[PDB]
Amino acid sequence: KNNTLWTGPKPEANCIIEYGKQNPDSKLTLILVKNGGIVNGYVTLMGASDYVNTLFKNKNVSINVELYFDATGHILPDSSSLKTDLELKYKQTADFSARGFMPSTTAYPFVLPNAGTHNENYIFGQCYYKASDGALFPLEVTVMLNKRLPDSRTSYVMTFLWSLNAGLAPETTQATLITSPFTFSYIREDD
């Protein structure tokens, strides 16, 4: 009903993980669905470059995805990891206002760029990486909502961090990186 905002169900490469990289090296699947006063989210990342697909040759990895949105909830692609806007599961007059999908600035305000403050702006959880030999490794997930503005053109922030801190690296060869689906919910802004 104007209630699902997403990347599509099986997006082509649309996201940049590696630094200084100019073109997408990964496929982010992100779905944001309204449910009353919350949004229910679903996110998974799949590697699409040799750099991304050899990260799990190390035992300590960190994958960061940052999404910056304007005042009507559309992605600002220059600064964001995701290079294509999200779309409604149903089509556009003016493309549209996606502000009701954004994290509430009342629940998750923007604050002083002071270190280690306002930990009420984070959601923590876990998802998994299934290695080529089958071993299942937990990935610690951090989602940051709003909190830190990256510049003067952004209205909303949603960032994802997947962390691996294993005793032994999952892989010894290149393998398709796939984070298992992570679900989360947050208090949403008004439409």
Binding site: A131, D133, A135, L136, F137, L168, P170
Partner: protein, 238 residues
Amino acid sequence: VLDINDNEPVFTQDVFVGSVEELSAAHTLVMKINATDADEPNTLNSKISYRIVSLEPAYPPVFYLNKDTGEIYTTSVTLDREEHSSYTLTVEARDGNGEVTDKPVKQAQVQIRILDVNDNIPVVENKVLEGMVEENQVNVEVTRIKVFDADEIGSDNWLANFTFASGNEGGYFHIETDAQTNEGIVTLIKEVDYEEMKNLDFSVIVANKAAFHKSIRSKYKPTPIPIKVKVKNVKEGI
């Protein structure tokens, strides 16, 4: 000529043998037993019903015998070789409706060997960790690191394996695994001067020659084991 049930089902072999790997998923086909009944086909006189008479070590049950097909599968209960390595099992084949009676029917035996996987991390038993060498010595035994492993003795899943973490950048030590006692044998490959007072302490990491099973990785954090080494002084003169 009208049929009568005048001959029993008999197994193709007095003993069957199969193997299944440890930690196998449920309903994994292990093997299959067979029998034959010479009576009129597709009549109760020839319907065989395969049943498990006894089992060893009996409890718990990790095998289900399909009475109609004779196929043996693994249950929802996981197999662990360190719990039980080999299962020996007496089966049975019955005539008619497959009703268990006090009648003595033909029976064979099944022997399932459980395959070992590296799902157990090595552990140093060596209760007193300190090396010992003399001054001006070479090619001497510093210490013997005794290590225990639950997995199948002799196998690469059991064989200890070593790597220096830190402290051997000077190339004063060499380590190798004694495959018979599973000891890490470290020895001096360089003379040391007691008076120069170099610290020869070092740390090492233990693992298995073969990689660890996917069941246990990440649950294993390579923690370097420190080993202090003491040096003996000797009267050298001027």
